[PDB]
Design a binder for this molecule. Structure first.
Ligand SMILES: O=C(O)c1ccc2c(c1)nc(NCCCCCCCCNCc1ccc(-c3ccccc3)c(Cl)c1)c1ccncc12
Length: 330
């Protein structure tokens, strides 16, 4: 069978916590009344939820209600417990309240509101400084939650609210977030297709926070090369191929060989053989202002097959790519 792997940071946080911290299946939820809040309009639907603008009739303030599509009680407890545990954390969305309609009796979560900025204006006049700035904000969220023994597992653009006016970022949707436990084997059917780490794509279940670090690499990559998405795969299988055409096959097969992964027979014929491309092949006229030897160097240290060699959030935060935002924050 496959070789075991431990997270090399925050490995044992959860063990040293009281059982209540992570035993969310026994968390007892106290359901307020959904009539505290009046739905105003629908802000977008999803597979797991639908989200509405609402106002809280008591203090008259704008809020957001995420009405959860039917899923196992425990998956709801999980997301609540994780939100409860991470509250006040840098750039984590704030759970305000938890309610349940009186008639339909359907659970919902009430979140703080974020004056989100249109991505059409946030993907043309976004400067190389703004990309380093907000990326550093995401690492604040990632390093906090990882330090709190939590992996997010759905890092993707649609989950990062930015209030460009106030220069505020919030990491949202913890529906997929889970607790890290050394040795645990996890469901690899997680995150969105363009931000799956190779470990999900090859079915290696003993992964850790390093998964969140790949998804970040995908996003930085797509922003400095102005290619959305950067790895554009048709399915989960072709996604690995699109990755292999860029990182090379030789590292991929070493990764498989090192963890003694058993690769799918489907993959036995589509991966082929590909060299590792230098990042210079992706820089052109329109995007050269966002590319630099520091971004490239930081990017290359995030996108790695081997999850153990990916930078931790705290290492990322110390990378020279962020030297200016660190200095300006003082
Ligand atoms: O489920 C929950 O918990 C939850 C909690 C609260 C809310 C919630 C869900 N849903 C809400 N709306 C429903 C629809 C989703 C809105 C789409 C957001 C996409 C923005 N993303 C673009 C972007 C732009 C730039 C970058 C970037 C920048 C610098 C460097 C690299 C990248 C990067 Cl990464 C990304 C909502 C609305 C108001 N208030 C609260 C919420």
């Amino acid at each position: 069978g496959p070789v075991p792997s431990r997270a090399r940071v925050y490995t044992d946080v959860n063990t040293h916590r009281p059982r209540e911290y992570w035993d969310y299946e026994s968390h007892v939820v106290e359901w307020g009344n959904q009539d505290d809040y009046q739905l105003v309009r629908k802000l977008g639907r999803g597979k797991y939820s639908e989200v509405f603008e609402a106002i809280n009739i008591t203090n008259n303030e704008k809020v957001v209600v995420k009405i959860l599509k039917p899923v196992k009680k425990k998956k709801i407890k999980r997301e609540i417990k994780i939100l409860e545990n991470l509250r006040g954390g840098p750039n984590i969305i704030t759970l305000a309240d938890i309610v349940k309609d009186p008639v339909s009796r359907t659970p919902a979560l009430v979140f703080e509101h974020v004056n989100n900025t249109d991505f059409k204006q946030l993907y043309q006049t976004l400067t190389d400084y703004d990309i380093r700035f907000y990326m550093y904000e995401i690492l604040k969220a990632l390093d906090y939650c990882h330090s709190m023994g939590i992996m997010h597992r759905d890092v993707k653009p649609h989950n990062v609210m930015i209030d460009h006016e106030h220069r505020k970022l919030r990491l949202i949707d913890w529906g997929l977030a889970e607790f890290y436990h050394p040795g645990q084997e996890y469901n690899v059917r997680v995150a969105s297709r363009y931000f799956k780490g190779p470990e999900l794509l090859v079915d290696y279940q003993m992964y850790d926070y390093s998964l969140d670090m790949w998804s970040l690499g995908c996003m930085l990559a797509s922003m400095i090369f102005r290619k959305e998405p950067f790895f554009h795969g048709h399915d989960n299988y072709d996604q690995l191929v699109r990755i292999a055409k860029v990182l090379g096959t030789e590292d991929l097969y070493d990764y498989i060989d090192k963890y003694n992964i058993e690769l799918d027979p489907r993959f036995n014929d589509i991966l082929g053989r590909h060299s590792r491309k230098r990042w210079e092949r992706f820089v052109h006229s329109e995007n050269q202002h966002l590319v630099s030897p520091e971004a490239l160097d930081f990017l290359d240290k995030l996108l790695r097959y081997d999850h153990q060699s990916r930078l931790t959030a705290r290492e990322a935060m110390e990378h020279p790519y962020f030297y200016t935002v660190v200095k300006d924050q003082a």
